[PDB]
Every structure is written in structure tokens, then in C-alpha cells.
Design an enzyme around this catalytic site. Sequence first.
Site, short mmCIF file in Angstrom:
data_model
loop_
_atom_site.label_atom_id
_atom_site.label_comp_id
_atom_site.label_asym_id
_atom_site.label_seq_id
_atom_site.Cartn_x
_atom_site.Cartn_y
_atom_site.Cartn_z
N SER A 1 0.46 -1.36 0.04
CA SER A 1 -0.70 0.06 -0.04
C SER A 1 1.12 1.17 -0.28
O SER A 1 2.04 1.54 0.31
CB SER A 1 -0.74 0.05 1.48
OG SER A 1 -0.93 1.24 1.50
N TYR B 1 -3.75 -0.05 10.51
CA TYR B 1 -3.51 -0.84 9.01
C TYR B 1 -2.54 -0.80 8.34
O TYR B 1 -1.49 -1.51 7.49
CB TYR B 1 -4.84 -0.77 8.00
CG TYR B 1 -4.79 -0.08 7.22
CD1 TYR B 1 -5.25 -2.45 6.22
CD2 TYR B 1 -4.68 0.50 5.46
CE1 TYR B 1 -5.16 -2.04 4.65
CE2 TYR B 1 -4.68 -0.24 4.32
CZ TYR B 1 -4.51 -1.23 3.88
OH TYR B 1 -4.64 -1.43 2.50
N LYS C 1 0.97 -3.44 7.61
CA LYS C 1 1.85 -3.43 5.63
C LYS C 1 3.33 -3.05 5.67
O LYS C 1 3.62 -3.68 5.03
CB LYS C 1 0.89 -2.04 4.95
CG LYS C 1 -0.75 -2.92 4.65
CD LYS C 1 -0.81 -4.12 3.71
CE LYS C 1 -2.44 -4.53 3.73
NZ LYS C 1 -2.63 -6.38 2.44
N1 NAD Z 1 -4.05 1.92 -0.70
C1 NAD Z 1 -3.93 0.12 -0.26
O1 NAD Z 1 -2.96 -0.26 1.22
C2 NAD Z 1 -4.17 -0.99 -0.93
C3 NAD Z 1 -6.03 -0.72 -1.21
C4 NAD Z 1 -6.73 -1.42 -1.83
C5 NAD Z 1 -6.54 -3.38 -1.09
N2 NAD Z 1 -5.81 -3.22 -1.14
C6 NAD Z 1 -4.93 -4.68 -0.08
O2 NAD Z 1 -5.60 -5.49 -1.26
C7 NAD Z 1 -5.25 -6.47 -0.75
C8 NAD Z 1 -7.20 -7.28 -1.24
O3 NAD Z 1 -8.24 -6.31 -0.84
P1 NAD Z 1 -9.74 -5.60 -1.52
O4 NAD Z 1 -10.08 -4.47 -1.82
O5 NAD Z 1 -9.99 -7.24 -2.46
O6 NAD Z 1 -10.43 -6.35 -0.22
P2 NAD Z 1 -11.64 -7.16 0.23
O7 NAD Z 1 -11.75 -7.32 1.33
O8 NAD Z 1 -12.31 -7.57 -0.62
O9 NAD Z 1 -10.31 -8.74 0.32
C9 NAD Z 1 -10.09 -9.85 0.99
C10 NAD Z 1 -10.04 -11.03 1.54
O10 NAD Z 1 -9.67 -11.29 2.44
C11 NAD Z 1 -9.97 -12.55 2.72
N3 NAD Z 1 -9.28 -12.86 4.54
C12 NAD Z 1 -9.45 -11.48 5.17
N4 NAD Z 1 -8.69 -12.19 6.46
C13 NAD Z 1 -8.38 -13.13 6.05
C14 NAD Z 1 -7.53 -14.16 6.55
N5 NAD Z 1 -7.37 -14.05 7.81
N6 NAD Z 1 -7.72 -15.42 6.08
C15 NAD Z 1 -8.19 -15.66 4.88
N7 NAD Z 1 -9.06 -14.94 4.11
C16 NAD Z 1 -8.95 -13.80 5.03
C17 NAD Z 1 -11.48 -11.85 3.45
O11 NAD Z 1 -12.27 -12.68 2.98
C18 NAD Z 1 -11.98 -11.19 1.38
O12 NAD Z 1 -11.71 -12.08 0.90
C19 NAD Z 1 -5.47 -6.17 1.23
O13 NAD Z 1 -4.57 -7.30 1.49
C20 NAD Z 1 -5.63 -4.99 1.07
O14 NAD Z 1 -5.33 -5.03 2.13
C21 NAD Z 1 -4.01 -1.89 -0.44
#
Ligand code: NAD
Lengths: 338, 338
Positions: A124, A149, A153
Site C-alpha cells: 500500500s 492498517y 503493511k
Molecule cells: N491503499 C491500499 O493500502 C490498498 C488498496 C486496496 C486494497 N489493498 C490490499 O489489497 C488486498 C485485497 O484488498 P480488497 O479490496 O480485495 O479487500 P477484500 O476485503 O475484498 O479482500 C480480502 C479478502 O481476504 C479475506 N480474508 C481476510 N482475512 C483473512 C484471513 N485471515 N484468512 C483468509 N482470508 C482472509 C476476506 O474474506 C476477503 O475475501 C488487501 O490486503 C488490502 O489491504 C491495499
Amino acid sequence: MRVLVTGGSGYIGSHTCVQLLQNGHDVIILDNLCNSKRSVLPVIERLGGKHPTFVEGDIRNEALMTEILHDHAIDTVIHFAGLKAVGESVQKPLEYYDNNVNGTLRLISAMRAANVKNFIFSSSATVYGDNPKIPYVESFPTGTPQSPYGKSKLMVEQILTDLQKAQPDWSIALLRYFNPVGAHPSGDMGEDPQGIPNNLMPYIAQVAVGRRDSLAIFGNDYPTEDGTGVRDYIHVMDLADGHVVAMEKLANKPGVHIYNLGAGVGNSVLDVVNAFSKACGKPVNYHFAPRREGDLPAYWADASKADRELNWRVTRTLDEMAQDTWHWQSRHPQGYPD
Amino acid sequence: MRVLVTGGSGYIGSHTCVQLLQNGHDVIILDNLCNSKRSVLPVIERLGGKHPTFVEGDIRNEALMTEILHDHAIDTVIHFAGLKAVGESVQKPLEYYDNNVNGTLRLISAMRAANVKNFIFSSSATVYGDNPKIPYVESFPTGTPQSPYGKSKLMVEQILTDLQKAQPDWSIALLRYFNPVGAHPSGDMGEDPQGIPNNLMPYIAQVAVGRRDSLAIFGNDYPTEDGTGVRDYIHVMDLADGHVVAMEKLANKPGVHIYNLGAGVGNSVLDVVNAFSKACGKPVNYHFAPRREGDLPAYWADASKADRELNWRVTRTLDEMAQDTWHWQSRHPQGYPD
Ligand SMILES: NC(=O)c1ccc[n+]([C@@H]2O[C@H](COP(=O)([O-])OP(=O)(O)OC[C@H]3O[C@@H](n4cnc5c(N)ncnc54)[C@H](O)[C@@H]3O)[C@@H](O)[C@H]2O)c1
Ligand SMILES: NC(=O)c1ccc[n+]([C@@H]2O[C@H](COP(=O)([O-])OP(=O)(O)OC[C@H]3O[C@@H](n4cnc5c(N)ncnc54)[C@H](O)[C@@H]3O)[C@@H](O)[C@H]2O)c1
Ligand SMILES: O=c1ccn([C@@H]2O[C@H](COP(=O)(O)OP(=O)(O)O)[C@@H](O)[C@H]2O)c(=O)[nH]1
Ligand SMILES: O=c1ccn([C@@H]2O[C@H](COP(=O)(O)OP(=O)(O)O)[C@@H](O)[C@H]2O)c(=O)[nH]1
Ligand code: NA
Ligand code: NA
Ligand code: NA
Ligand code: NA
């Protein structure tokens, strides 16, 4: 390749799985369903044109991760699983450190156990911390993230970096995301947040669909062209594609490969609102509210490195982002079925 | 008070337990014995003048921690348990992040579960990172630690800080250690490292006892008065006392209380060597070797804050440090029995 996609049923992971399957890879999805539904699975298979294997489970379960890895002869792992609600992270820090820091630690320890050495991590732009120099470049030293958060990361990036130094045969990509928006062009797959959406796009979309009254624009006095916050919005399809390329090009190439994945340009809150009103055919209702705690006025990515090294760059536009989002929102107002 | 002392059978924790018992507290020791022996237990009780309860177990086991906490109606927790070999941390990063980061996370999550809200953490001067300003003051922003060990400590400080913000009734002390040396004045309790000692004092002691040939002094060209590295050495007994005071004075006082625990002055490698030769009655053999990777030339603590706020300051001298160490080394050349 045989790839394990953690968080594969979530927003970005679902779209990534589709593109991976389209490219003929064998995909194994691992998800605990805390923020996604099984109903997305058949959509992934249909749009991907191939069946992905699904395992319900938790990244924190090292024994299971190990078993999966071995069972499926995984070659590479794409790690999207974790928690990402910034405000909630402030309120419930432990859950964030556990799911994100410990969760990744358990997963990579399982990898070690199974001899898997190719990894792609969802990082991120928060890792840059309060950086006055924009756009953000990979060559910049990281800063201090303001939320649990953000910190989680950056901690993971550091742990991965140390791991790579200690097991130099590993290939680890740190993909720094900016502001992912949009939905698959079919309008049948998209972001399905539960409760109040924290991000701008989905919030706007819910105002547009009639669920919400007015979009609260957090601050109108920033030192930006229109006074509203500026960000780097990237279409989830471009993001997904970046992941396929990174996975394919970096596999077995030892090192820590850091890349910002963004459009390389900034758009204000009003720009996004305007694009969405245009897409949905009605003016989106909004009002100005006070600045959101901890927000930066403006930032965007410097994406030259990914272009140069991976030959990857975004191709969808801001309008497409708004249009695809509205298409999904409007076709599926209740999101994925229970 | 009822206090759970994790890592209680190790070096600093053993001495701390003695002082705690002397002060009449009820002590429960939790240790996995990865770096200590059960044979220290009876010594702790004898020198402490009261029996401490002992539980063999791992900080990573959240369920057990929870049970202990509740079972013993713990009021406060002193957390010494973790791994601390810097060089090994570079070679085996995951074990460090797991024992230190996850280990602390599991323990404080158990605390939450059991409603325990007073904590004392063994922190480190590594958190200051490469700070040119010496002495180090608590008001200084943290830097970037160079080893996985250093990073793990800073990560824990951050997690604890976030936890406190989220559960503001908590009292958390971040005690930053500099260079703990010495042994209980009885000569029957002290540092018992296995294999090659990484720290200066024990190494010198083993040269003195005849186990080792010559002390390799890492670098003689630093910008210090004698060209050797300079550090803040603190007697383990003063450190132990600082912990009792901190525990007693900070319990139920909400906040994150950061204190450097050190003597407030610097001593070079030669100064330490000279003090030990004096203590043992023979010149300690040594030679100059190249600088150790990642070492800083000189640093010491600014201990005014602890003096002011806790009315705590060191009382033992460098000579005492050397003398007590030699006394223990010489009385118990094989350390604690198996
Ligand atoms: N600017 C930023 O920091 C940026 C922007 C968006 C997303 N991201 C990262 O990208 C990734 C995907 O984001 P997203 O928008 O698809 O979110 P999202 O919530 O749709 O996807 C995350 C998935 O992980 C699963 N999950 C959560 N904790 C879990 C665990 N302990 N074990 C198994 N599954 C688990 C959830 O059920 C979900 O399906 C994440 O790591 C998010 O932090 C970062
Ligand atoms: N400059 C510095 O950073 C500084 C100086 C010395 C010590 N410290 C810290 O102070 C603490 C005590 O140091 P020490 O010199 O007494 O070391 P030590 O090895 O003697 O004591 C640590 C104890 O923790 C136990 N332990 C380790 N991992 C455990 C786990 N997962 N569960 C349960 N028990 C576990 C070991 O068996 C040992 O008895 C450590 O946290 C250390 O990192 C920091
Ligand atoms: O309801 C909302 C959500 C977001 N924003 C603004 O939109 C931008 C993007 O916010 P978001 O939370 O989606 O992601 P971030 O940039 O914080 O990662 C920032 O300028 C926010 O201040 C807003 O005005 N109202
Ligand atoms: O065998 C040794 C161990 C340590 N040192 C030096 O002694 C000081 C303290 O080293 P130590 O590893 O005990 O602790 P640190 O200060 O690194 O926490 C530093 O200047 C080291 O370079 C040395 O010359 N030889
Ligand atoms: Na190594
Ligand atoms: Na729904
Ligand atoms: Na709160
Ligand atoms: Na021994």
C-alpha cells in the site's frame, strides 16, 4: 503456473483470479469468507473460463497453509488476504496486526515448510507515510504510516525483505496499491462491501443507487486545484492484469521487486463525483464536510518503474472506472447473494 | 501485586523475579526454557526469599496465557520472553518475528481476554536506529533498526502504542534497555549463555575463566576517545530494581510510559576489558579485529526521565558489574546444572 491466491474471493483477488484463469494458470483460492461470499465463485469460473479450486480457511492456520501448498504443488503465491478498514484498524488494532502481520507470517512460514519461494504481496501507498514529495517513487525511503492498517503493511514489507535476505532464492514482489476502483466490464463482478463503504467510489455508487442521501466530501480547503483531496485511481482490471504480469515475469527471479501499481496521475474528489454523475445519468448528491482525520491532501504514484521493467501500464480510464462501477452496482444492487 | 513474568527464568527476568519476591509480590513465572534451565528456579526462590510459581509454556500459546492470567488473578505482566541474538536474527528472521512480534501479540490478546491491563515490556535502544544525537532521549522519534531483532522490538512498541490508544485504560511501560551486565551479588545467579556469547561481558568472562583464547575487539578506529566502541552498561540488579519500581508506580496509571533504563554514561570496550582484568586478577587477553557489521561507534542513554518520574537511577558501578560477573562465572563455570 500453479498459484495460490489468498483472499481470492474478495474484491481485487476475484478480478485477479479471472485474469489468471484466462491466462491458463491453475488457481487455488484460499479465503476465510470474513469479507466475501461463496456466491462469487461461480462468477469467477464463468468469467475466467476455467474452474478455480476453492478452500475455505484462514491464513493464520500455518498447518493448513502448508498442506494446501504441498497438496497443490503450488509454484507461486499471491497474497491478498487481510483486513483493510482504516478507521476500524484504529479502533481494533490487534485484529489488524493479527490478520495482517501474523497472518502473513504464518503463510510465509508455511511456504518455507513447503519449499515454495515465489510471492506477491498486496502492499500500500500508506507505506510512504506522510511524504511531501509527489508522486511517490519506489526509490523513496518508507515513512511512518498513521494507522494500524498502514503500519501492518509496512511491517509485512520489512519482514518479507528480511526473509528474502535470509533465503535469497526467493522472489518477492511488493506491489504498492493506490486507489483501486471499478468492476469487471461484464457488470457481474465488482466490489461488494458490507455496511457503510469507507472508500469514495462505492460510497458514491450507493448514493447514486438511491441507498444513501449525500456524499460527504471530506474537506474542501486543501491546497489542490479544486480544494478537494487528490488521489491515483486505478481500475481493478488494470490492477488484476499487473498482478498476472508480475507473477509471470518475476517467478524464479530472486530479489525483492517493489512496484507502485497506479495510473500515475491524480484526480480530485470532484473529478470522481463528476465522472460518476456522467456515468449514472444523474447528478450525484454531495456536500462538503470537515477533513477526515489523518488524510493527506494529494498524492499519486510514479509508475515508470513498472512500465519500464514489466512493460505494464494502465489502460482503462477514469470514466471507465465510474461506468463499470455503476454497471455492476445497478445490475446487482444487493451484491452477491447469500 | 500478582505479577506474571514471562521469560522469568532467563537472565534479566531471574534477577527481576528475586527483587519482586523481596518486595513481597506474588510471582508467576512463564517460560518455555528455550534459553534457560529449571535449575535457576530454586535459586530464585532462595534469593527472593519466597516461592514463585512456575509454568512451562510458550507466549505464542494464547489459550494457555489466558488461562494463566485468569487462574492466577494477575494484576500486571512483565514481558521479558523473546529471542535476542542479533546476528542469528539476520539469519533466521521468521523465528524472531514469530517469537517477538507474534509472541507479544498473543500475550496481549490473552490479556485482553482476561481483563488484565498493566504491562511492562522489555524494549531496546535499537529502536532509536542510527541516531547521531547522543545520548538518546525518549523524546526522540524512533529510527530504523538495522536487524530483524531491532525491528521486532520497534514493531512491538508500535503495536502496544496502538493498543493503548484503543483501550485507553491500559498502563504500558516501554522500558528501553541499553547494555545489561553483571550478576546477583551472591555469585549464585547470573547470565548463562549457551555456546559462543554474543555480548562483550560474557565473552570477556569466558576468556578470563580460561575457556576462550582472546577477546576480539570489534574495531579500533571509531571516532571515540580510545577508538573502540562506546556503550551504556547497566548492572542487571539496577535494571531489576527499575522494573520493580516501574511496575509499582505505573500500575493503573493509564498511558504509554517510555523510559530508557541505563546508567547515563558511556564506557568503551577497553574500559570494560580493564575493569574485568582488575576484577579477575589477571590481564584479559584481547586483540583488535575489524568492525562488526552494523555497529554504531558510540551511544548511551539519557536517563533523566526515569530519575525525575520514577525516582530511579543506577547505583552499582562498572567495577561492580565486572566483579559480580567474575564472581558468578568463577563460582559456577558450568552455569546452571542440567
Ligand atoms: N491503499 C491500499 O493500502 C490498498 C488498496 C486496496 C486494497 N489493498 C490490499 O489489497 C488486498 C485485497 O484488498 P480488497 O479490496 O480485495 O479487500 P477484500 O476485503 O475484498 O479482500 C480480502 C479478502 O481476504 C479475506 N480474508 C481476510 N482475512 C483473512 C484471513 N485471515 N484468512 C483468509 N482470508 C482472509 C476476506 O474474506 C476477503 O475475501 C488487501 O490486503 C488490502 O489491504 C491495499
Ligand atoms: N539492547 C537490548 O535490546 C536489550 C538488552 C538485553 C535484553 N533485552 C530484552 O530483554 C528480555 C530479556 O533478555 P535476557 O537477557 O534476560 O534474555 P534471556 O534469553 O536470558 O531471557 C529470555 C527468556 O525468554 C524465554 N523465552 C524465549 N522465547 C520464549 C517464548 N516464545 N515463550 C516463552 N518463553 C520464551 C527464554 O527461554 C529465556 O528464559 C528480552 O526480550 C531481550 O530481547 C533487550
Ligand atoms: O466518503 C468519502 C470517502 C472518501 N473521501 C475522499 O476520497 C479520497 C479517497 O478516499 P478513500 O478512503 O477511498 O481512499 P484513500 O485515498 O484514503 O486510500 C480521499 O481524498 C478522501 O478524503 C470523501 O471525501 N468521502
Ligand atoms: O566479542 C565482542 C562483543 C562485543 N564487542 C563490542 O562491545 C560493544 C557492546 O557489544 P554487545 O554485542 O555486547 O552489545 P550491543 O552494544 O551491540 O547491544 C560494542 O561496541 C561491540 O562492538 C566486541 O568488541 N567484542
Ligand atoms: Na544468511
Ligand atoms: Na448483499
Ligand atoms: Na477507540
Ligand atoms: Na552449562
